[PDB]
Amino acid sequence: LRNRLTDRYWRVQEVLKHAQHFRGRKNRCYRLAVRAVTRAFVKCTKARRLKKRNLRTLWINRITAASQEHGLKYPAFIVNLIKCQVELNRKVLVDLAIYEPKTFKSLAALAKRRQQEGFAAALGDGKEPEGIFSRVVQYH
Amino acid sequence: GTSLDLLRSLPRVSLANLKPSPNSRKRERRPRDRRRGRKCGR
Amino acid sequence: GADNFTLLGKPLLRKELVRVEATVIEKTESWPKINMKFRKRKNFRKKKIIVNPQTILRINTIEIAPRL
Amino acid sequence: RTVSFQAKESMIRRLEVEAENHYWLSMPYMTAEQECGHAAERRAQAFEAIKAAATSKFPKHRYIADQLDHLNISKKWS
Amino acid sequence: TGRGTSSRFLTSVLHNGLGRYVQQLQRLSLSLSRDAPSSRGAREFVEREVTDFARRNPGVVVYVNPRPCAMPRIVAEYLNGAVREENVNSKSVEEIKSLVQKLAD
Amino acid sequence: ISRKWEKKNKIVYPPQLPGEPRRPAEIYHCRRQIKYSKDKMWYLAKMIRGMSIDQALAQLEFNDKKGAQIIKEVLLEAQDMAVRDHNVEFRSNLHIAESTSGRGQCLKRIRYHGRGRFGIMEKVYCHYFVKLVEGPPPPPEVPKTAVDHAKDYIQQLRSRTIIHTL
Amino acid sequence: KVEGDIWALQKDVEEFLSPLLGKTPITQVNEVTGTLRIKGYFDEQLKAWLLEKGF
Amino acid sequence: AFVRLTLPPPKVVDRWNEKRALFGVYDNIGILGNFEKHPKELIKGPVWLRGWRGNELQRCVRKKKFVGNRMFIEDLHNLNKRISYLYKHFNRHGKYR
RNA sequence: AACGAGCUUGGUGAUAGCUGGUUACCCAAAAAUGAAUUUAAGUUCAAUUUUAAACUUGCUAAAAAAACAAUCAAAAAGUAAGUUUAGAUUAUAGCCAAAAGAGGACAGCUCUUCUGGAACGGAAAAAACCUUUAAUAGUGAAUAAUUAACA
RNA sequence: AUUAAACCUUGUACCUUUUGCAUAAUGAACUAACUAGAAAACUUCUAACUAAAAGAAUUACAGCUAGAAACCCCGAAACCAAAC
Ligand SMILES: [Mg+2]
Ligand SMILES: [Mg+2]
Ligand SMILES: [Mg+2]
Ligand SMILES: [Mg+2]
Ligand SMILES: [Mg+2]
Ligand SMILES: [Mg+2]
Ligand SMILES: [Mg+2]
Ligand SMILES: [Mg+2]
């Protein structure tokens, strides 16, 4: 016994301190806790890049709900807003609906009008001045 | 000389300050880590 | 936007119309974050503590001018 | 299995992209003869840099200050 | 560790930026050894950097208490009452200077 | 071995101010190395919990279990050392605040089997702890009424917030 | 067995050997050991070159 | 695991005792003393490994050579078996051939 | 108290091409083909791979012309590797899809040759098919395969 | 993640092993302690002196001397000797 590890207590503590909230023997036995913790760390790493995709799917649900109140499907709302050259991401649009309902109606009406203008342009062929909102600003 | 002059300014040479010449020694690889443990190179 | 009107840029408003002023309240770093790649022989030690710098800002004032 | 409608549209678009690539590759700016020797100078210089790196391998300079600097570890306040 | 750890919401001390910005760092205390290799880097910090830092931040009371010591220690006190101590054992002046600036901010 | 339940009986609190509520008495008694199982003893200890000492000395007397007499003895020692050495005015002003049984040191012996084989036998002992607190038994738990059940549901709904947004 | 400022010796050798090779020779200066190292064999040229200086 | 519930006693080393103070003196007895004595002659140790170093198999054989005839029966038997084990290891086993 | 030949001690740490095991972090590169062998549960060599060093042309492509879609390859060009020297192993059973022969100038089946792969995305199933240059924090964004068919 | 412990979403134990696949097949009830890579011929790296190096015998057509740097564990059926 010339050399023995005098600090193995803290090595076990590092693994165990990450297992107290568990249930069963895994929260107190090193042979069982250690296996449980690794999965806990791996899932935490594979879930940092799944809250960025679920939080977006949440937004699409709420934007689909928001536009439907004013009579617009989700595809029509987003596409037309871009076609008007206004760029608002799916995170603020949900904020606008929840906390600024009156402003969202303006966006819904604006998106609806461009949709109507686009329909008119396709329906009316030839050289005709496009809708007032249909006009696209150019940056050089 | 000029190099000898630098030694005068530096602290006293003692048994603590001793250092081996750069790259003179090598790391002795032991079998206790994943790269060099498990099947242990065999 | 306001209670009764809103102004939308295409895609940005002109500087004269809107001036947003903020202050740098505090500069910090993020709490330790655990990265552990899904791989065979995961082990408990093949884990890295990612930490990032952070700053906190207060949006002091949003002011508008009659230059429509 | 039935071929999906969206799948047909996707490949048709890819076919169009490749088909156009035929067109842009059918108009060579320079003929075979006109190409010969036009870039000889640049190529030769590039290889010379490669050779210089390969034959410049050699150990590094050693300094007394670096080794004597280890004594600074024992610096103190009088 | 997210489920295994506590959490909170974004917050300030006393609405720091609403009125006048007040520096949160309140006090820094550094203990050093006259003759110790580990505290050599910190001794350089006191010689040069400490004076500049004290003037730059005049709301941070700085205490330097050289004593026979094994590990140099920096203790940071904030206005909300929170304490923070970081070990400076065998850290060069560059590391300490960067480390201290994080504490002030 | 660790005898800490014995020491807790010696704690001295500081004198009270003239209008402070009169501190209820606490007594700490136990018996060790009882020839009985800790699992069997728990049922007896659990029974008496939250009862007076003249209501726990009656239920025990008519139980057939061996431990009933053992517990009764340490519920009478506790009832005597409280009045004499802990200044409890009335014998009938006590109630069993806590009571549980703990493992003791055991002995290892050989239980023989039928083919030249055997198994390891353990002769089991246990300890039994009781605390008595001066005062009538705290009134029992009152089941939640239907109105109380309904109120919690509303309170739960009221706490609702809009999640994952400003 | 170099003594004094070894760097001056390196500069002098670099000029001396450059015209023959047509390029600056690759060299190492070991200040602690007081030696100068040159790639390739130039023993004969350097011996005479050092002889002229009188070292 | 379990750790001590009290601090162990302080260990005090006197670095200016006679043995430590004069450690190393006469290590250059040869070059400074007209090579009368080789420094290896100053080593205190087993007779078979004063001023000598080798691996265990060589060490085993060298111990036998110097004191093979003055050893106890059991010690000599163990040494013989120790030599035969090492011989088959170093001459018939190992990763490299 | 288990005799195809008792038991105890010693030889003895018997020997095992066989089974099992072989304890900190980090960065990087990285393959089951040919030959012989009481050989096919092994080893040795070639080939591959690797660390270092030396100095100079290498890979794709390669017109005409040969020997007949290959074996060979010159000017070019796109591009950065290739050769020699010193040291060193493990490896020497593949798995599945898609092409082409060849066994009965068959399909299959067994081989042989070339090509590709080893998701967190997709295809009821889902290591092998299709989309995918490494890994990092963000309550950003544009996208791929596909989400069956309306004959 | 969350206002909220559980409900909601995502997720086919570990090691060894088989092909680079397992819903296989081996091994683990749990805790504490113990429990398995070792040698310098050739090479690389670092220095001392240098047609010489080495504190006797050695090597040399830039060598020579010194330093550092390497090759595990457990397990048979058996065989022989001598007692009992
Ligand atoms: Mg070793
Ligand atoms: Mg019997
Ligand atoms: Mg039992
Ligand atoms: Mg092959
Ligand atoms: Mg064979
Ligand atoms: Mg074999
Ligand atoms: Mg088992
Ligand atoms: Mg063995």
From Swiss-Prot, chain D:
The keyword Disulfide bond does not apply. Keywords: Mitochondrion, Ribonucleoprotein, Ribosomal protein. GO terms for cellular component: mitochondrial inner membrane; mitochondrial large ribosomal subunit; mitochondrial ribosome; mitochondrion. It is found in: Mitochondrion. One of its GO terms (biological process) is translation. The keyword Repeat does not apply. GO terms for molecular function: structural constituent of ribosome. Belongs to the mitochondrion-specific ribosomal protein mL63 family. Identified only in the intact 55S subunit. It is unknown whether it belongs to the 28S or to the 39S subunit. May localize at the subunit interface and dissociate from the 55S mitoribosome during subunit separation. This is Large ribosomal subunit protein mL63. It comes from Mus musculus.
From Swiss-Prot, chain F:
Coiled coil: none annotated. GO terms for cellular component: mitochondrial inner membrane; mitochondrial large ribosomal subunit; mitochondrion. This is Large ribosomal subunit protein uL22m. It is found in: Mitochondrion. Transmembrane segments: none annotated. Keywords: Mitochondrion, Ribonucleoprotein, Ribosomal protein, Transit peptide. The keyword Transit peptide applies. GO terms for biological process: mitochondrial translation. Component of the mitochondrial ribosome large subunit (39S) which comprises a 16S rRNA and about 50 distinct proteins. GO terms for molecular function: structural constituent of ribosome. The chain holds residues 41 to 206 of 206 of the full protein. Belongs to the universal ribosomal protein uL22 family. The gene is Mrpl22.
From Swiss-Prot, chain G:
The keyword Mitochondrion applies. GO terms for molecular function: structural constituent of ribosome. GO terms for cellular component: mitochondrial inner membrane; mitochondrial large ribosomal subunit; mitochondrial ribosome; mitochondrion. It is found in: Mitochondrion. GO terms for biological process: mitochondrial translation. Keywords: Mitochondrion, Ribonucleoprotein, Ribosomal protein. It comes from the Eukaryota. Component of the mitochondrial ribosome large subunit (39S) which comprises a 16S rRNA and about 50 distinct proteins. Interacts with OXA1L. Belongs to the mitochondrion-specific ribosomal protein mL49 family. This is Large ribosomal subunit protein mL49. The gene is Mrpl49. The chain holds residues 112 to 166 of 166 of the full protein.
Swiss-Prot record, chain H:
GO terms for molecular function: structural constituent of ribosome. Its main location: mitochondrion. Belongs to the mitochondrion-specific ribosomal protein mL51 family. This is Large ribosomal subunit protein mL51. Keywords: Mitochondrion, Ribonucleoprotein, Ribosomal protein, Transit peptide. The chain holds residues 32 to 128 of 128 of the full protein. GO terms for biological process: mitochondrial translation; translation. One of its GO terms (cellular component) is mitochondrial large ribosomal subunit. It is found in: Mitochondrion. Coiled coil: none annotated. Component of the mitochondrial ribosome large subunit (39S) which comprises a 16S rRNA and about 50 distinct proteins. Interacts with OXA1L.
